[PDB]
Amino acid sequence: ASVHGTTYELLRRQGIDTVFGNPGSNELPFLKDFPEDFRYILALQEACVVGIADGYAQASRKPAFINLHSAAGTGNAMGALSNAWNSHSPLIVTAGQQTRAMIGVEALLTNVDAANLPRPLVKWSYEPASAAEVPHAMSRAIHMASMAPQGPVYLSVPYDDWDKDADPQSHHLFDRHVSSSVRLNDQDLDILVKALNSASNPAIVLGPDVDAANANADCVMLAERLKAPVWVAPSAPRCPFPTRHPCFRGLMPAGIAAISQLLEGHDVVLVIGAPVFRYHQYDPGQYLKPGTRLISVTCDPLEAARAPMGDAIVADIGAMASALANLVEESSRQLPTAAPEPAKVDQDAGRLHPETVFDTLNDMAPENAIYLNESTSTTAQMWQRLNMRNPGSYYFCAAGGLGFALPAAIGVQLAEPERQVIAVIGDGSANYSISALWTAAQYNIPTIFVIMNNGTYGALRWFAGVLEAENVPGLDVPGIDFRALAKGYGVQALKADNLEQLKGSLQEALSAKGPVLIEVSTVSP
Amino acid sequence: ASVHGTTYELLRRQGIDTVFGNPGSNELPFLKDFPEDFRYILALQEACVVGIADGYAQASRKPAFINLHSAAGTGNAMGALSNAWNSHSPLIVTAGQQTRAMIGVEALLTNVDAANLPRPLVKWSYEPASAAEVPHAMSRAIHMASMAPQGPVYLSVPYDDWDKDADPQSHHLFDRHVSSSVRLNDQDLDILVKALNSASNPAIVLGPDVDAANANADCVMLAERLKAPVWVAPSAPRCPFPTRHPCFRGLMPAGIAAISQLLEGHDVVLVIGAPVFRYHQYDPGQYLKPGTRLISVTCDPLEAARAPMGDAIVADIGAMASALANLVEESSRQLPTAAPEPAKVDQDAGRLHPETVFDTLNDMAPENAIYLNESTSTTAQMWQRLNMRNPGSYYFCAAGGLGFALPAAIGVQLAEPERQVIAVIGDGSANYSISALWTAAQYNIPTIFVIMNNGTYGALRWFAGVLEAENVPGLDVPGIDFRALAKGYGVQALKADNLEQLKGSLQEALSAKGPVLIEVSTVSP
Amino acid sequence: ASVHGTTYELLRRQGIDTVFGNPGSNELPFLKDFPEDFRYILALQEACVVGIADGYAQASRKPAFINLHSAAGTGNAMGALSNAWNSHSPLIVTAGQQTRAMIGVEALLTNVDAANLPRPLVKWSYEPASAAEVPHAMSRAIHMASMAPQGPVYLSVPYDDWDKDADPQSHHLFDRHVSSSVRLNDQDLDILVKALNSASNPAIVLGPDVDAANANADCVMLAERLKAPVWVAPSAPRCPFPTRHPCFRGLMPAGIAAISQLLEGHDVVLVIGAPVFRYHQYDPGQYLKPGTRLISVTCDPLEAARAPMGDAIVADIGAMASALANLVEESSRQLPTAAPEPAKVDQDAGRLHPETVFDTLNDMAPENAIYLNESTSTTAQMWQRLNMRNPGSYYFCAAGGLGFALPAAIGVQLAEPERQVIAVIGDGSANYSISALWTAAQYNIPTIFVIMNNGTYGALRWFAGVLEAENVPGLDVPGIDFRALAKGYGVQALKADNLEQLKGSLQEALSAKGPVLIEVSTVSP
Ligand SMILES: Cc1ncc(C[n+]2c([C@@H](O)/C=C/c3cccnc3)sc(CCOP(=O)(O)OP(=O)(O)O)c2C)c(N)n1
Ligand SMILES: Cc1ncc(C[n+]2c([C@@H](O)/C=C/c3cccnc3)sc(CCOP(=O)(O)OP(=O)(O)O)c2C)c(N)n1
Ligand SMILES: Cc1ncc(C[n+]2c([C@@H](O)/C=C/c3cccnc3)sc(CCOP(=O)(O)OP(=O)(O)O)c2C)c(N)n1
Ligand SMILES: [Mg+2]
Ligand SMILES: [Mg+2]
Ligand SMILES: [Mg+2]
Q: Which residue in B75, B400, B488, B514 is the catalytic one?
């Protein structure tokens, strides 16, 4: 067998059937004779390739495989890798290297010091020392991406390796099963259960690893049992709980003092599947107030180590949420009461308030819609205004790196063909990965893109206000016609300048058989 | 003085007056109170920011200053840094970091292990240990980028540092002059001159550091004196010699055997300002044939170390080319005869052959035009067909990373307002950095973009043919309307489906007062 | 030819004839069939191997070649590499790797992520992608170590590579000559000469790269011409000037304020071959006082970039010192007057004052002795008390890393068989690399080791006093019998408890035919 044939066998035997890629010359020997049972999803720039693969991996809850061109292709993807690191996305990134006989002279397209290029944004990064090692290296990459805490990995392969003979002993790689599905030992889990059972006023805080594990339903049972309010940890990349369940409290503000104040009076705070905490703004104060103690369940030792407070347990979120939900007592306390519905903001016949856009989406979208957010100034309103009943219903760039949602929404729609994906993306953010639109057109992946056009980088105007910063350049982005960009890449395009046109455009998009972009004129901040 | 005021003083005193940027929240404290004598050039994605700055630095022959947002912004620019490394471009890349009080908890937008992110594509990468160190660190970055061999550098600055008090001793940084303008000592330079004077059949090979040094005219005098043919080193990122001078031979093929065969019978080959050599294709054979010896003058120790043959001298290209051109004897041999003009390829009334496009550009463009190439399958024809008399007339992505020429052509046009820039870019390559078009529209930088539309990644079809590789996916890019993309970003757009329309479109673009994009329908390979 | 035969041919053709090593199993395929024209110098621990090679390279002014065992052997040498980085020592460090078929599984003795292990203490670090690349990689290592600014390099080689067939084109590597012997261009050098000629009160400051370049005599001519006082830059690893020449001023204190005060009233300060400056203690103040400007000539861009003041020129120290010494005018000012001799410290019939030891060494050692210092509390007195007329007469660990002088003194003595080496080493410092003594015994390298025994880490007691730090543990080192350690490793040993015994012991050591260790009882601080 060749290294090529052994490698595609390993991939298929490990459940991989799709290559997300932008091809180049060092990759043609890998991509030739492409197997008939695989599919190749082309995107036109590598931030788009990786973002599509990342949405697909997060929604499918399985690793996604990427092929990029040498150093420049890998480099164009590194902002996308920053988000994938923070979302624990299981991405297997491969890149082609020059032929081994050409690496010493540093021929054009040599990836110099290749394994160092994507650091520190990968769990494992490697270039094999010989051709016959490639299948074993690929096996290491698959399992490094897939074991808890999941995350991106990188493998560089000289182009001459693929046609060499494989080691016949590589067959032992094909069916390896590697598990990190673990939970706290019995004795210590009993101590934790008794602490939860004994709390007088527990609170629960959930992060994105809950949605990744599909632990959402177990966390609903846990919160119902403990009769406890549930918040989503700050800077949330996913939604871990039904947002109209009576226990739901919403998204935590990303500030130290704000969070300790919110938790004041709760004696035990159980955090599951989140860093403690992904703060953002400067908001100094106490980490926790007197009388509150915190216990964190995390799948990531790096999260456990850096929490400034609380106890921690490093374990699989699926296994721990299931065990806690089935072991805790049913408290006799009253179930929390549901938050009230948000109010309708006054809306005239002109430009749209963001609040109106989300209320209208909530009114018209199917109950199993999946939303993506890259409308940076409107996140609080989006979290209040969209009823997300089901798992896998929300994604937001986990490292704050713009250029995620447009491509990721195409990958999510590919992963979930029966759930309507609706990406709500600011006019600024839409540009970072605009060419991803072409992949939705070419493959007919029916994502709906809602572009919130207010002419400016609104969140930066907000942060500049907080800092009291004057005379900052570069904050305005006038003069972009999103209908024309959609036409450029083959996507049907609509414009909504008022509420009547928003409703009409959404009814048309929801009825369409392909991807649709709607440019919405929103109010300037 | 604050760190902010001291830093902008250092920049202005070191000749920096322009910030190329895409802003973010960790950078607002740097960008506030932006000085009235500086300009800020916004681009919508960071590969575009860096590419614009890189074209500006290469054409201006001085460092360019960039400001990006944390890890994700820096990561989105890393393919652009791969080209800047290979072109020795003096780029000062700064990125904002979280406030120092928030870095430990890894708050959102913390750039983790920041100085390692852009490695190995930078000469120096650093985050200061305190606020007061920032001006000194910035001074180190300026000089590291600017000293031979020039190249990109990286500095990460916590956002809280800018408002702190500066060290009053920082004033000693402002007027430092650092020189690497050096040449080989007298005794050894005399030995080299005598070897050149004594050669029976010398050849000269020039690389991009000649154009960077503006050593082109000195190299013409040197070649006239020695009566020697002149080639451009393979994979050429710049043009170092007038392409219709009688000594000019053209671009070397990027193969080991091809180059030794070309040099056969030349007793001494003097390479100036190039790696030895930036080969690309697999073309095994002899590095040099019997009877040829090679001497390399390079500004980069890494180039001298990795050459597989020849002697080398590590020195400034400007100083060495000037000294050699003024010291060598006038040989009594006959001056080489000029290459003949290329032939006209037969052209019907349909889609354009690339050869027709370059002949027409050559006929109609001003004699001081500047060209950019990212039409990967047509490079040989472009080098034969365009008469480039002047320095600074050609750029091509030095690491082969697509997404360079569209933004770089805007930076070059900003650097050279009186020279018409014409970027010739394939339909595939045009997508990587398509949003750069918006910066040309917003600032009215009158670059002309010629998009060669043949529907496919043509160079990859070529390389697949060489490899005899069948069933490769992802090679076609149908369905892109470049006129609509230009409209999307505010650039006037024309289409040329035949030669009559090409001539008309070029006459209109050449007469226009702003940037123009022409979509040219070219023949499919 | 095999890779083994081609590599030893490359080494011999590049002037390498000695391997400093501690062998291991991954290195046996390199070391077998060891060529009869090479010598192998064994040391018992890798800090000793590297220190011996470093003294040999610094004294011979040529690269030295080292072979170490995998990761653990390389790791044991990393404190020695820290000194070699700071002294710009041209060291070629090679380490054996597992066979390529065993690297993936991480067999015992695999050097994981090998090229990253010695960073940041090396100029270049690499593992080749195939066996046939090894000779080319070795060529890169030789030239990277040898080009200005010289320094250590690292190459890792899988053990199976040595018996593979070499590429016949590797012969082009054997005779490559690479030069960095460069100086500032004529026009700018004339500007610098005119500034020196015009100065009213110039001062000269010299660093270790002057001694490395053997530029000492040219710097004496330069100082005589300019009639200028000469200081040695602080934290001096070498001696660049005759210490009883009338212009000599001594070692600069390593403090910011102390140095600006020393230079006050000097209008132009020319620094050659030093960082600006290797300060140590906290001594805040002005970098330079009003009226003094500084010009630095350095072979190291990293030094030029980080100087907090002055202009800089990056060039070869030998070439620049020769050009300046031959171009400057003979000033009509009076030649500086020689510093007076140091005073005799009162000495009773008991334990020795360090001052007495250095005066006695100066009285009895030959005029061409070479000294090494690792007696950390006595450096100021050593620099006042030893007349060092000749180049290559002093070495002190350039990064402050103890364990350098004992092994380095053996390498220096091997490099300079006709110059008596005398290492003056504190009782604390002597332990770090004590096993190096065995190499002096086995090869009969007649270094004299003078151990200053005061029972304590004296310099740390001093620094603790400056900090006013009380209750610091670990400062005393009682209970070491250095005569017994010397016996353990086969070196003749003497003890001196008073001045009479010091004189007798030195007369015996100076007359001996092999290495001698003298334990001197010195006064406690
Ligand atoms: C790759 C990249 N580059 C730049 C930034 C900086 N940045 C951003 C940030 O630095 C801050 C992000 C942040 C921080 C906390 C919470 N949410 C977001 S936001 C932004 C403007 C986006 O504008 P738009 O999409 O039109 O939406 P709004 O008008 O609703 O705000 C920018 C530019 C970024 N986050 N990522
Ligand atoms: C960031 C990035 N991603 C991918 C590649 C791979 N690649 C390329 C390469 O891997 C090879 C590049 C090369 C190698 C030697 C010389 N010149 C170029 S070329 C290419 C197609 C570009 O298509 P287009 O612009 O339409 O022009 P042609 O039709 O005339 O060819 C691609 C996609 C690349 N070079 N850079
Ligand atoms: C590898 C290593 N480990 C530890 C140190 C720390 N250190 C040292 C340092 O941290 C400081 C070094 C310094 C700083 C400036 C100038 N000169 C030296 S000195 C020292 C004691 C050495 O004792 P000894 O040899 O008996 O001489 P003295 O009695 O005359 O002082 C020690 C231990 C060190 N420098 N290097
Ligand atoms: Mg906006
Ligand atoms: Mg094309
Ligand atoms: Mg001591």
A: B400
B300 phi/psi in degrees, rounded to 5: -130, 110
**Residue B119, annotated as binding a ligand:** yes
CATH assignment of the domain containing A420: 3.40.50.970
Helix-strand-coil percent breakdown of chain C, rounded to 5?
40, 20, 40
Single residue among A178, A197, A224 that ends a domain in this structure: A178
Count of beta carbons in the 10 Å neighbourhood of residue C341: 11
Give the residue from B121, B305, B61, B87 showing the smallest Cα distance to B208.
Answer: B87
A27 carries an active-site annotation: yes
Task: Decide if C189 contacts B323 (C-beta within 8 A).
Answer: no
Which of B148, B173, B308 is nearest residue C136 as measured by Cβ atoms?
B308
- Shared domain check, A438 and A310: no
CA distance B58 to B395: 9
CA distance C251 to C241: 11
- Reply yes or no on whether C400 is catalytic: yes
Helix%, strand%, coil% for chain A, nearest 5: 40, 20, 45
Shared-domain flag, residues A266 and A408? no
Taking the centre of ligand 3 as the mean of its atom positions, its distance from the CA of residue C122, in whole angstroms, is: 23
> Which residue out of B46, B133, B416, B519 is catalytically annotated?
B46
Q: Write out the residue range of the structural domain in which residue B134 sits.
A: 1-178
Rounded to the nearest angstrom, the minimum Cα separation between B175 and chain C is 8
C119 is in an annotated binding site: yes
In this structure, the answer to whether residues C328 and C197 fall within a common structural domain is: yes
Give B309 to chain C, closest Cα distance, Å: 5
Same domain? For A208 and A124 the reply is: no
Q: Yes or no: say if A467 and A494 are a contact pair by the CB < 8 Å rule.
A: no
Q: Which residue has the tokens 């005239």?
A: A348
Pairing of strands C39-42, C182-184: unpaired
Sign of CA dihedral A203, A208, A209, A213: positive
Regarding whether C174 and C191 lie in a shared domain, the answer is: no
Clarify whether residues B55 and B147 are in a common domain.
yes
If one residue of A25, A31, A44, A438 were mutated to test the ligand 2 pocket, choosing by the most ligand atoms within 8 A of its CB, it would be A25
The three state secondary structure string of C463-507 is HHHHHCCCCCCCCECCCCCHHHHHHHCCCEEEEECCHHHHHHHHH
Residue A319's CATH number: 3.40.50.1220
Closest approach of A73 to chain C, Cα-based (Å): 21
Do C205 and C250 contact (CB within 8 A), yes or no?
A: no
Q: Give alpha helix (H) positions in B227-351.
A: 256-263, 301-306, 317-327
Overall residue count recorded for chain C in this entry: 525
Q: Give yes or no: residues A111 and A238 share one domain.
A: no
**CA distances from residue C49 to C15, C81, C111 in whole angstroms, order as listed:** 20, 11, 19
Which of A143, A178, A213 is a domain's end point?
Answer: A178
Q: Give me the sheet containing B178-179, strands edge to edge.
A: B178-179, C311-314, C293-298, C268-272, C203-206, C230-232, C248-251
Distance CA A276, CA A282 (A): 16
Cα gap C252→C275, rounded to integer Å? 13
What count of other Cβ atoms lies within 10 Å of the Cβ of residue C438? 19
Experimental method for this entry? X-ray
Alpha-carbon span A71 to A111, nearest angstrom? 5
- Residues lining ligand 3, judged by CB closer than 6 Å? C 79, 280, 374-378, 400-403, 426-429, 432, 454, 456-460
Number of domains forming the structure of chain B: 3
CB C253 within 8 A of CB C234: yes
Cα–Cα distance, B65 to B62 (Å, whole number): 10
Which of residues 113 through 132 in chain C touch B, CB cutoff 8 A?
A: 124
C323 & C347 share domain:
no
C133 has a chain A CB within 8 A of its CB:
yes
Q: Which residues pair with A238 in a beta bridge?
A: A395
